[PDB]
């Protein structure tokens, strides 16, 4: 009898399995697929980086920390990954060249860490190898036919006629989660406001967008577009360029390429090949067409329908529906892996407590559910606001600086809690982060929520037709200029600064500016 | 319509894909799997390294040359690969510690290149990406339902209802070859003498064998066992240890582990799990048991029925049955990839000429079939001779030095042709290698065939019970000491030298020894000065 059976051998499953196996619990991993296998969720963000470090140090699994830095990934996982110096955004309209005043860039500051483009076949192989090394058992090419709970534990039945007996079940799989299907956990219809279907593949011979735009020198970004994740924004959709070869002597010549389309505004074209439908969108935008001219697909194309789903319950007695099994919004802002790390941090210690005491009263896991549903709802608002804003750059510009400002604040809030636990060898300061009033919010301060609440109200009003994008942009631009908290030294309070470039000098001035600030939160976090 | 449709997205199909696509031909790759995917054939040899460079240089595909060197594989493919400094051999008997006087090592000389342990998932992905970049079209998860030939070309029918029209078909897949099935090309029963079934996986936490034997200091090998492919030899079978992490700061912690068993001596155990049957053999050999003590499988185990298969013919009107779709012997001595490289070299230019003339007369590809069948037959004896010899170390000792000696002579032969073609810029010298009387024989020299023809006759006689292994070993050990060609400075003519260690100084003397040698072949291939050796 296993302590925990985990469905899903992805990062979500194998990071948890590693944690539980290292602390001496008996784990079984089940997955219908076999490593090596392709996976999406390739771009990283500061919050993923710091919470990966938090989980690694808190639970004593060094392999998880090797994902928290571009340098450690190359050194420990594989050479086959790309760098992420920045988030890049470029507006396009049908037939037109991109207006060089309708771009945004957020260079990631060194304080949160060196972000990467994850070649997921290698990162997911790496963490599975670690999970098996720590003592996890594994069955790959394993189809779950039935999941049956009782007072003693759970019996998983496989297609091959085998059964796995355990005390607890975690479903860390995706959309086709057996637990979600078999217990009827999915919300139908979904509560989520964001709508987007997807077409994606891996390509060879993708050029840098830098080399295919005619940008006046003074409007070129501080660091190259190709050194980060490029976002090609248009009416109710966007395209990602995530290169793996964007650094000197890079071994992996592939580039991850996909398009998110609101299926309400871009209806299905089943007369077209996934490839043909993808290229029909490329042909709308001259600069994107020029970037992808030589590019050739090295995979069978994936074409989805509406990608978004939610669940009504995510915990029960002796089971947890984790992260990607519970819900999904969109690739935009690589929220998925941040959400996965937040849940693993929250679930791991509680589940180990429950196993030690042999008490599976669902009350102990009440916060895990609250965090899960909160993460999804805030993620929903962020992406829905953004898709709405894509119709009018001046409105997007507000969404951009409200979203990106939180990276540095929310980032240092976690780093502070971790350094206090590091220096004092006491896990009270990391545990203190859970004592926050807005579960799921990436910068859970009162002034930020109020600010983001207004952004959501106006965006949702634009979407309903109660306000115009011009009026909403007008109001949010006033609020930004009236703001006192938006890291002025970096230019987040300045709508005319499109390329936020955090230098060494500027972060010093942020610290000085923060020292004598009237808001307690700004002093606590940034001084 | 495509010029060529290639069935198989492994190195065999994608290396050929790259060559044809690079020369401006319209190519389609069809495979039932999708990259990334696991594959075997992980260890490399001198002949593979040198012929990879010949192919790359001859056909102008630089990516193929990046497989020909450990350093170039890490730099261009991925960091996920291991080094191969030597072939290691260690004899084991049930319940007993390994006898340190019953080991063999062959350190691979610098001249033939730096060998690797290929993590094939990254190796096969790399070349597939190259093929597509060169302009190959590909369909993955493509199941071939039907193949039919007319006078104008060939039609391939997919299970999804689609069809692919081409002028020529190459089947570069494996055992379940759609082309061999369609035309009933497989020999039943197979003509092959070698018998072996297999259990294999990838494991994490495999220790070095060096750290789990108490070998006397004077009998320890010049270079570590773990820096190469270790062969745990036993009665009518052997186990491979192929670590991907056998070098400083290596990223890939996996080690490839598998066992070959003569299915006539070890009958199937369907009452056991593949894992259980594998561990039942590990537990026979205390030293192996200590090596794998902490090792855990990271894949679903493979267990085979009997791996050897052969074809009655391998070329026809507008089709070729290529390397692994034609036949297979054994993982032993990593002959699989050498055979693939040899066929690609022979077929590529012949196929492109035929396409350009629009003439597919089977007489054009006569040498491709002769080479295909020859590679397999010689591969068959080498492994069968080795499997017979595993019963008695003194007999194996003669198989080892006859095999490993040819790997330096035959290697230098191709390398001479290669460096001469680069100097003159003239392909003549590389094509001249096809002008040998023994197609498929890795060292195609009169004296070497006679030596190997005897080793085979004796080995096959031991197997048939007409001679004892002791009697066979005695006759062969005489021939070795009567020999005048077995690279004395390296110790190939010395049965009491088990660990061959080709160093800079020893290779200088081979050159001097070769100068004014009574045999012309020895002079032509090995003869040089200590001035020309400086370069290296
Ligand atoms: Cl799924």
CSV table of C-alpha atoms in Angstrom, one decimal, chain A residues 34-38 73-80 119 121-122 125-126 128-130 132-141 204-205 249-254 296-300, chain B residues 34-38 73-80 119 121-122 125-126 128-129 131-141 204-205 249-254 296-300:
chain,number,residue,atom,x,y,z
A,34,UNK,CA,6.3,8.1,-21.6
A,35,UNK,CA,9.4,10.4,-21.2
A,36,UNK,CA,10.8,11.8,-23.3
A,37,UNK,CA,7.6,13.7,-24.4
A,38,UNK,CA,6.8,17.3,-25.6
A,73,UNK,CA,19.3,24.7,-16.0
A,74,UNK,CA,22.2,24.6,-18.7
A,75,UNK,CA,24.6,23.1,-16.0
A,76,UNK,CA,22.3,20.4,-14.4
A,77,UNK,CA,19.3,19.7,-16.7
A,78,UNK,CA,20.4,20.1,-20.4
A,79,UNK,CA,22.1,22.5,-22.9
A,80,UNK,CA,18.9,22.6,-24.9
A,119,UNK,CA,12.6,22.9,-23.5
A,121,UNK,CA,10.9,17.4,-22.8
A,122,UNK,CA,14.3,17.8,-20.9
A,125,UNK,CA,12.6,14.1,-17.9
A,126,UNK,CA,15.1,15.6,-15.4
A,128,UNK,CA,11.1,12.5,-13.3
A,129,UNK,CA,14.6,11.0,-13.1
A,130,UNK,CA,15.0,12.8,-9.7
A,132,UNK,CA,12.5,7.9,-9.3
A,133,UNK,CA,16.0,8.4,-7.7
A,134,UNK,CA,14.4,9.6,-4.4
A,135,UNK,CA,12.5,6.2,-4.4
A,136,UNK,CA,9.2,7.0,-6.4
A,137,UNK,CA,7.8,4.0,-8.3
A,138,UNK,CA,6.5,4.7,-11.8
A,139,UNK,CA,4.2,3.1,-14.4
A,140,UNK,CA,4.3,5.0,-17.8
A,141,UNK,CA,1.9,4.2,-20.7
A,204,UNK,CA,13.5,25.4,-37.1
A,205,UNK,CA,14.9,28.5,-39.0
A,249,UNK,CA,26.8,28.5,-29.0
A,250,UNK,CA,23.2,27.3,-28.1
A,251,UNK,CA,22.8,23.6,-29.0
A,252,UNK,CA,18.9,23.5,-29.6
A,253,UNK,CA,18.0,25.2,-32.9
A,254,UNK,CA,14.2,24.9,-32.3
A,296,UNK,CA,9.6,24.9,-40.9
A,297,UNK,CA,7.6,22.9,-38.4
A,298,UNK,CA,9.3,19.8,-36.9
A,299,UNK,CA,6.1,18.5,-35.1
A,300,UNK,CA,2.6,17.4,-35.9
B,34,UNK,CA,7.2,11.2,-33.0
B,35,UNK,CA,10.5,12.9,-31.8
B,36,UNK,CA,11.5,13.0,-29.0
B,37,UNK,CA,11.6,9.1,-28.7
B,38,UNK,CA,14.0,6.6,-27.0
B,73,UNK,CA,28.3,16.0,-30.1
B,74,UNK,CA,28.3,18.0,-26.8
B,75,UNK,CA,28.9,21.3,-28.8
B,76,UNK,CA,26.2,20.9,-31.5
B,77,UNK,CA,23.6,18.2,-30.5
B,78,UNK,CA,23.2,18.3,-26.7
B,79,UNK,CA,25.1,17.9,-23.4
B,80,UNK,CA,23.2,14.6,-22.6
B,119,UNK,CA,21.6,9.4,-25.9
B,121,UNK,CA,16.6,10.7,-28.3
B,122,UNK,CA,18.8,13.8,-28.7
B,125,UNK,CA,16.0,14.6,-32.9
B,126,UNK,CA,19.1,16.6,-34.1
B,128,UNK,CA,15.5,15.0,-38.0
B,129,UNK,CA,15.7,18.8,-37.5
B,131,UNK,CA,16.6,16.9,-42.6
B,132,UNK,CA,13.5,19.3,-42.3
B,133,UNK,CA,15.8,22.4,-42.4
B,134,UNK,CA,17.3,21.0,-45.7
B,135,UNK,CA,13.7,20.9,-47.1
B,136,UNK,CA,12.5,17.3,-46.2
B,137,UNK,CA,8.7,17.1,-45.6
B,138,UNK,CA,7.8,14.8,-42.6
B,139,UNK,CA,4.6,13.1,-41.2
B,140,UNK,CA,5.1,11.7,-37.7
B,141,UNK,CA,2.5,9.3,-36.1
B,204,UNK,CA,19.5,6.2,-12.6
B,205,UNK,CA,22.1,5.6,-9.9
B,249,UNK,CA,29.9,18.0,-14.9
B,250,UNK,CA,27.8,15.6,-17.1
B,251,UNK,CA,24.1,16.7,-17.3
B,252,UNK,CA,22.5,13.3,-18.1
B,253,UNK,CA,22.6,11.0,-14.9
B,254,UNK,CA,21.0,8.0,-16.8
B,296,UNK,CA,16.4,2.1,-10.5
B,297,UNK,CA,14.7,1.8,-13.9
B,298,UNK,CA,13.4,5.1,-15.4
B,299,UNK,CA,11.6,3.5,-18.4
B,300,UNK,CA,9.1,0.7,-19.1
